[PDB]
Ligand binder design. Structure first.
Ligand code: HEM
Ligand SMILES: [Ar]
Length: 148
């Protein structure tokens, strides 16, 4: 505690409808950083517009994969060292597909946006601070996949 409990309580709301909330996360992401759009290359083709991504089964499967990684982080919030090796290889995979490490800061802001809009009154400054810390720890582990 105390960050721990704020994370578990707030995630309970989001995890009721993961694809709907993850849709908000990625809509926001492309609004902030449109140059992330070409990195989702399924069947060797590029999405033209952000709304094109929302029709792609492969893209929606990636939303589910994202939400499952965040769920594992919440389940393990008391000790994240258990996920470190997995997160390092997840970083390496994203480096491989072309994501720059700086772009994970925009992902974090999109995550915070999605929580603010979902929780409304209930997304307190303490809750924000807890999620920033948890997300920061996840990215620090992933960052090792970009060497060092
Ligand atoms: C700008 C942000 C991101 C981009 C452009 C991106 C793109 C991709 C791409 C192209 C793949 C490979 C194809 C696929 O499996 O759908 C992938 C795999 C994956 N991504 Fe992401 N991703 C991003 C962020 C994230 C985040 C934040 C997470 C989790 C916290 C995540 C979790 C995954 C997982 C679990 C896989 C499967 C990895 C594997 O092969 O084992 N991604 N991502
Ligand atoms: Ar997170």
């Amino acid at each position: 505690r105390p960050e721990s409990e704020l994370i578990r309580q707030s995630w309970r709301v989001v995890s009721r409808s993961p694809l709907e909330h993850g849709t908000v996360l990625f809509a926001r992401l492309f609004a902030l950083e449109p140059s992330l759009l070409p990195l989702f290359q399924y069947n060797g083709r590029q999405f033209s517009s952000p709304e094109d991504s929302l029709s792609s089964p492969e893209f929606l499967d990636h939303i589910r994969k994202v939400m499952l990684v965040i769920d594992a982080a919440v389940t393990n919030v008391e000790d994240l060292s258990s996920l470190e090796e997995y997160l390092t290889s997840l970083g390496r995979k994203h480096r491989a597909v072309g994501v720059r490490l700086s772009s994970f800061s925009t992902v974090g802001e999109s995550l915070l946006y999605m929580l603010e809009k979902s929780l409304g009154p209930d997304f307190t400054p303490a809750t924000r601070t807890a999620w920033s810390r948890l997300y920061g720890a996840v990215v620090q582990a992933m960052s090792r996949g970009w060497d060092g």
